[PDB]
Amino acid sequence: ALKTKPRWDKYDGYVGNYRGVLGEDIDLDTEANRVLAVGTNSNGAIVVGAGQTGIKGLMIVAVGADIHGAMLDGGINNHAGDPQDVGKHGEITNFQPTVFGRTFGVAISATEGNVKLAVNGVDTGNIAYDTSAANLKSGIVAVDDGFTADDFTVTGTAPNFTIVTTRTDVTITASGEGVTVTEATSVAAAGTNYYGHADGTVNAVKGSDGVYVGHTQEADRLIVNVKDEED
């Protein structure tokens, strides 16, 4: 048709897969129809990411869409205080990793002079082949497009940087010679261990906070078996 989207295939509901209530509203553009790593806050309530307890399960907020492909707003399973289902043991099919915003690797091929990047196709002010991480931020912010500093993050050292963003509607590219840009990408990989994080993302990498949530088999599936986070 056009897209498949993650769903519980096996979820029992008597074996410590549990009902709770949300502590917060779920973002329908950013968090619905995704595999969310979840904990509980200092009240009885489900939160995306590490609450008071750390990660205790996975949640899929299943939401329909209109015939034009937008999410149905008036749902009863996605606002604060709505009831939701959290799984520790089960299978998720049409599985995909979960990531928030956009992130771009920038790297400079030039060893002298200046280079140029485009934000949503409009060109940035010139930046040195040795600009500071502070001056990629200042360059990228400084165009009359209305995004401003408030929704960019930058980190790196002169040869390369990561431009992170919380929004989906901003795209970085190269436009001048002497610089290359790749958006990061995530897709499920067969025979891999997946890991929930304090953000609520589910990824193949355990950093300093990753809590094992399951392993895939064939890439389109996840066998969920949450090694619950502990103190």
């Binding site: 979820y11 897969n17 009902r19 009831p83 289902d85």
Partner: protein, 50 residues
């Protein structure tokens, strides 16, 4: 004396028949029962017991 006691007698009768009843069950129970609550439904999981 049956003339001087007559009003005391009548008063005690009216109070007795209004304050008192004959017992036929010498012991009476009183109980404390507890309660139940609903919860809101989810799509996959199940409610708590009662």
């Amino acid at each position: 004396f049956a003339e001087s006691i007559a009003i005391y007698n009548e008063a005690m009768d009216n109070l007795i028949q209004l304050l008192t009843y004959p017992v036929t069950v010498p012991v009476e129970p009183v109980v404390q029962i507890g309660e139940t609550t609903f919860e809101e439904a989810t799509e996959l999981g199940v409610p708590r017991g009662a």
